[PDB]
């Protein structure tokens, strides 16, 4: 009933179609991947996620001079605990 009209309709309309969602997490790692499931807490079990975050080389010169680099890692199947979710976003 109201499972499909609330604000979690972004998640239950993305787990039906198995489309990918972009999640800005709390430590500013970005999870791109398909929701296999979610719940009240947005404990989203996800398949095939690109986890994309930013680094700097952290003063490799000794003079604190470098530019941030985009790093990413692949995770096959994850269980993202949903407190660390800030925003979930369906794709355009």
């Amino acid at each position: 009933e109201e499972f499909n009209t609330g604000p979690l309709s972004v998640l239950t309309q993305s787990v039906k179609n198995n489309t990918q969602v972009l999640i800005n997490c709390r430590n500013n790692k970005k999870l791109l991947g398909r929701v296999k499931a979610f719940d009240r807490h947005c404990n989203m079990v996800l398949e095939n996620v690109k986890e994309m975050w930013t680094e700097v080389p952290k003063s490799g010169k000794g003079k604190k001079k470098s530019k941030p680099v985009n790093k990413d890692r692949y995770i096959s199947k994850m269980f993202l605990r949903g407190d660390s979710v800030i925003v979930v976003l369906r794709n355009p």
């Binding site: 470098s66 530019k67 680099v69």
Partner: protein, 210 residues
Amino acid sequence: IFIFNPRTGQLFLKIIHTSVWAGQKRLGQLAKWKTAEEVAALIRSLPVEEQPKQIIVTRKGMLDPLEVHLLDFPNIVIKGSELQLPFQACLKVEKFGDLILKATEPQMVLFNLYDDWLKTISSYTAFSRLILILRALHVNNDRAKVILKPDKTTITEPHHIWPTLTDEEWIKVEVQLKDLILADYGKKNNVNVASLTQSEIRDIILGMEI
């Protein structure tokens, strides 16, 4: 054969000897299928973790022999390119050039065209830096060579290719090679410099036609 990985910078440049086609008695009916079979033999040489699944041919007359010679690998994608990349600029640099010409045996010389820029910046902007270097060295050889050393004090190591510069020197030499590229283009392409947006600057360094 220049087999350039954008992501890992591992350039597999295969030396093709003069004796392969000085006395071959053949047409291009050997040539297309021969460069295709040798790049396929490179694919068969490497393990499955290092084999690609997407192969981009610069010259459009090679994807049709690559379809034939890579039916042992249906998992790979052979697309053409609208942007052509000047890897004859690799021939113009003296190291690869006399490496190729002095090589009496056909071989599978490896290189890493990003020297160690993967510990500093991305692989995308390292690719854009490499194609700035290669296109600017294609539009003028020794002018871009003397731009490539902003001082005559800097040196490259014998295991490197390009001179060891850090971020400030690299950004200044990048804008120097960039307006060198656009100055040579606007000298040749009848139109000025300041009428082009950065999408058009992007596909002029990349090799597309507007």
